[PDB]
Design an enzyme around this catalytic site. Structure first.
Site, PDB file in Angstrom:
ATOM      1  N   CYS A  52     -12.381   3.114 -14.218  1.00 31.43           N
ATOM      2  CA  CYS A  52     -12.829   4.478 -13.970  1.00 31.43           C
ATOM      3  C   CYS A  52     -11.615   5.391 -13.863  1.00 31.43           C
ATOM      4  CB  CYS A  52     -13.654   4.512 -12.681  1.00 31.43           C
ATOM      5  SG  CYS A  52     -14.676   6.005 -12.586  1.00 31.43           S
ATOM      6  N   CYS A  88     -24.663   4.153 -12.387  1.00 33.06           N
ATOM      7  CA  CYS A  88     -23.809   5.323 -12.254  1.00 33.06           C
ATOM      8  C   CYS A  88     -24.407   6.583 -12.868  1.00 33.06           C
ATOM      9  CB  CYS A  88     -22.494   5.015 -12.910  1.00 33.06           C
ATOM     10  SG  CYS A  88     -21.310   6.373 -12.901  1.00 33.06           S
ATOM     11  N   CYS A 101     -17.367  -1.472 -16.866  1.00 34.17           N
ATOM     12  CA  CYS A 101     -17.610  -1.222 -15.458  1.00 34.17           C
ATOM     13  C   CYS A 101     -18.876  -1.854 -14.934  1.00 34.17           C
ATOM     14  CB  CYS A 101     -17.675   0.258 -15.235  1.00 34.17           C
ATOM     15  SG  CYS A 101     -17.912   0.749 -13.518  1.00 34.17           S
ATOM     16  N   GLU A 160       0.790  -1.225   0.000  1.00 32.86           N
ATOM     17  CA  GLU A 160       0.000   0.000   0.000  1.00 32.86           C
ATOM     18  C   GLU A 160       0.819   1.269   0.000  1.00 32.86           C
ATOM     19  OE1 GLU A 160      -3.335   0.293  -0.548  1.00 32.86           O
ATOM     20  OE2 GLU A 160      -3.250  -1.822  -0.860  1.00 32.86           O
ATOM     21  N   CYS A 210     -16.569   2.934 -19.237  1.00 30.80           N
ATOM     22  CA  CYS A 210     -17.883   2.694 -18.660  1.00 30.80           C
ATOM     23  C   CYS A 210     -18.524   1.384 -19.083  1.00 30.80           C
ATOM     24  CB  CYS A 210     -18.813   3.877 -19.000  1.00 30.80           C
ATOM     25  SG  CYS A 210     -18.218   5.375 -18.161  1.00 30.80           S
TER      26      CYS A 210
HETATM   27  N1  LIG Z   1      -3.760  -3.047  -3.505  1.00 33.90           N
HETATM   28  C1  LIG Z   1      -3.783  -2.191  -4.532  1.00 33.90           C
HETATM   29  N2  LIG Z   1      -3.973  -2.695  -5.781  1.00 33.90           N
HETATM   30  C2  LIG Z   1      -4.009  -1.845  -6.812  1.00 33.90           C
HETATM   31  N3  LIG Z   1      -3.854  -0.515  -6.818  1.00 33.90           N
HETATM   32  C3  LIG Z   1      -3.665  -0.052  -5.575  1.00 33.90           C
HETATM   33  N4  LIG Z   1      -3.492   1.253  -5.184  1.00 33.90           N
HETATM   34  C4  LIG Z   1      -3.314   1.224  -3.825  1.00 33.90           C
HETATM   35  N5  LIG Z   1      -3.415   0.017  -3.305  1.00 33.90           N
HETATM   36  C5  LIG Z   1      -3.611  -0.806  -4.411  1.00 33.90           C
HETATM   37  S1  SF4 Z   2     -19.803   3.681 -15.140  1.00 39.33           S
HETATM   38 FE1  SF4 Z   2     -19.393   5.354 -13.612  1.00 39.33          FE
HETATM   39  S2  SF4 Z   2     -18.052   4.342 -12.021  1.00 39.33           S
HETATM   40 FE2  SF4 Z   2     -17.991   3.018 -13.902  1.00 39.33          FE
HETATM   41  S3  SF4 Z   2     -16.188   3.733 -15.153  1.00 39.33           S
HETATM   42 FE3  SF4 Z   2     -18.004   4.922 -15.900  1.00 39.33          FE
HETATM   43  S4  SF4 Z   2     -17.992   6.868 -14.660  1.00 39.33           S
HETATM   44 FE4  SF4 Z   2     -16.647   5.359 -13.555  1.00 39.33          FE
END
Ligand SMILES: Nc1ncnc2[nH]cnc12
Ligand code: SF4
Ligand SMILES: Nc1ncnc2[nH]cnc12
Length: 225
Positions: free
Chosen positions: A192, A208, A202, A37, A199
């Protein structure tokens, strides 16, 4: 869509399309999730992996990191940039060695008390490595929630950050929290994106508000002016 449908759609997506095989996701411990992290908050996954591997091979445990010379930690960090993260990484490893007897703290308050660990990173450490019931809110997750729920306003304003933390709390499940939190980070990082979000790939596209109004550019709000 309701909070329960958000969570279910994100977990069903993660199941079939999420990233599950990165080294910090295999035999997860608080120490490994913390290390990854901190490396990942200002560096992309592709650059982080060789560094994550070299740090785990050199420092198997947090006491190994704590006992190492700071100059050796900074030399191994070379190439990752944002070295305040490395200095805090080392201070935090020494705090775990001194206050928590070499075992990485498993409670929220003691993890968030570590140098370089904020509320979102502490929640990430505990939810991803132990399945504790904590939400996350880094830049990528802020963008997903702000677009899905039309949270205009700059997240630098306390009122907007609180709104986004409340939304994250509402959509984060207790059951499957480690999978949900990794999936929200994956979605913000890969689907996103800051510009031209994918989208159609997603799992939140049916509910959304930004996708319905082609208004992704408005959320989250940027700094004034
Ligand atoms: N565990 C994770 N995997 C992918 N992107 C990240 N950005 C921060 N923590 C992450
Ligand atoms: S549908 Fe909404 S949450 Fe998903 S990628 Fe598009 S803007 Fe982002
Ligand atoms: N699509 C995108 N992905 C990542 N960073 C960006 N900055 C601007 N557009 C971006």
């Amino acid at each position: 869509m309701q909070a329960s449908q958000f969570s279910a759609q994100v977990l069903d997506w993660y199941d079939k399309y999420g990233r599950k095989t990165l080294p910090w996701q295999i035999d997860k411990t608080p120490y490994k999730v913390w290390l990854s992290e901190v490396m990942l908050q200002q560096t992309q996954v592709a650059t982080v992996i060789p560094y994550f591997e070299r740090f785990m091979a050199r420092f198997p445990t947090v006491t190994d990191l704590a006992n190492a010379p700071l100059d050796e930690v900074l030399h191994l960090w070379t190439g990752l940039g944002y070295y305040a993260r490395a200095r805090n990484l080392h201070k935090a490893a020494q705090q775990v060695a001194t206050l928590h007897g070499g075992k990485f703290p498993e409670t929220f308050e003691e993890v968030a008390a570590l140098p370089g660990v904020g509320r979102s990173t502490a929640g990430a450490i505990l939810s991803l490595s132990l399945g504790k019931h904590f939400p996350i809110l880094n830049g990528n997750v802020k963008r997903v929630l702000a677009r899905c729920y039309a949270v205009s306003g700059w997240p630098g304003k306390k009122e907007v950050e609180n709104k986004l933390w409340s939304l994250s709390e509402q959509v984060t499940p207790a059951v499957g929290v480690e999978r949900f939190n990794q999936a929200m980070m994956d979605l913000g990082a890969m689907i996103c994106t800051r510009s031209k979000p994918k989208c159609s790939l997603c799992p939140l596209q049916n509910g959304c508000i930004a996708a319905a109004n082609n208004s992704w550019a408005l959320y989250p709000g940027k700094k004034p002016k």
